[PDB]
């Protein structure tokens, strides 16, 4: 129940204006910083992974790449290089002023060729933004989120043993959403999805 605890901590510390400083303290104390690198071999050919492997953008047209087994050939998705089968981990993602993006984790054994809906039942635990101002969790059905402010930077937190995945506004420390009590039985990868063509990339913050 640690990520449940911290959700409630963030309300408690809001009453004293210490929600940001609390966030920075507990994330460092409790969660190992995943130093997340994007795996170019997994990226849909319409996506571009930066040379430093921290940023992803969309191309106008697909690139000519091999259809190797690890590559998403339909979903506009890319994975981090390493997966987690235990412990507590976190990473922060700069979403900036992008009007569309989805992030979170997925199972190692998600279907990478063709389409299935991105939902927990298919091994995706993600949330994000669409159409400039619609924040949603990619549940079945989709759940609308009401956020007091648009986040520019998002913290993703995995507690594998307890089965919790949390999302925080990493600038002000406010809770966005938690998937509670999931029964993981597979390795989990960080996952990132971009549909739109926009000037701003999606960028992982280094550990
Ligand atoms: Mg497609």
From Swiss-Prot:
<feature type="domain" description="B30.2/SPRY">
    <location>
        <begin position="16"/>
        <end position="207"/>
    </location>
</feature>
<feature type="topological domain" description="Cytoplasmic">
    <location>
        <begin position="1"/>
        <end position="207"/>
    </location>
</feature>
<comment type="subunit">
    <text>Homodimer.</text>
</comment>
<comment type="function">
    <text>Plays a role in T-cell activation and in the adaptive immune response. Regulates the proliferation of activated T-cells. Regulates the release of cytokines and IFNG by activated T-cells. Mediates the response of T-cells toward infected and transformed cells that are characterized by high levels of phosphorylated metabolites, such as isopentenyl pyrophosphate.</text>
</comment>
<comment type="similarity">
    <text>Belongs to the immunoglobulin superfamily. BTN/MOG family.</text>
</comment>
<protein>
    <recommendedName>
        <fullName>Butyrophilin subfamily 3 member A1</fullName>
    </recommendedName>
</protein>
């Amino acid at each position: 129940k640690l990520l449940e605890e911290l959700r409630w901590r963030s309300i408690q510390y809001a009453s004293r204006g210490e929600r940001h400083s609390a966030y920075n303290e507990w994330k460092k104390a409790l969660f190992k910083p995943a130093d997340v690198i994007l795996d170019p071999k997994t990226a849909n050919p319409i996506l571009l992974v930066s040379e430093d492997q921290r940023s992803v953008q969309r191309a106008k047209e697909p690139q000519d790449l091999p259809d190797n087994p690890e590559r998403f050939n339909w979903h506009y998705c890319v994975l981090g290089c390493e997966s987690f089968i235990s412990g507590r981990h976190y990473w922060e993602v700069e979403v900036g002023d992008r009007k569309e993006w989805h992030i979170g984790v997925c199972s190692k054994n998600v279907q990478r060729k063709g389409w299935v809906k991105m939902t927990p039942e298919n091994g995706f635990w993600t949330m994000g933004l669409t159409d400039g101002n619609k924040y949603r969790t990619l549940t079945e059905p989709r759940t609308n989120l009401k956020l007091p402010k648009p986040p520019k930077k998002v913290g993703v937190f995995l507690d594998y043993e307890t089965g919790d995945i949390s999302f925080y506004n990493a600038v002000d420390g406010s809770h966005i959403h938690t998937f509670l009590d999931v029964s993981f039985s597979e390795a989990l990868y960080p996952v990132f999805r971009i549909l739109t063509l926009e000037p701003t990339a999606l960028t992982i913050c280094p550990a």
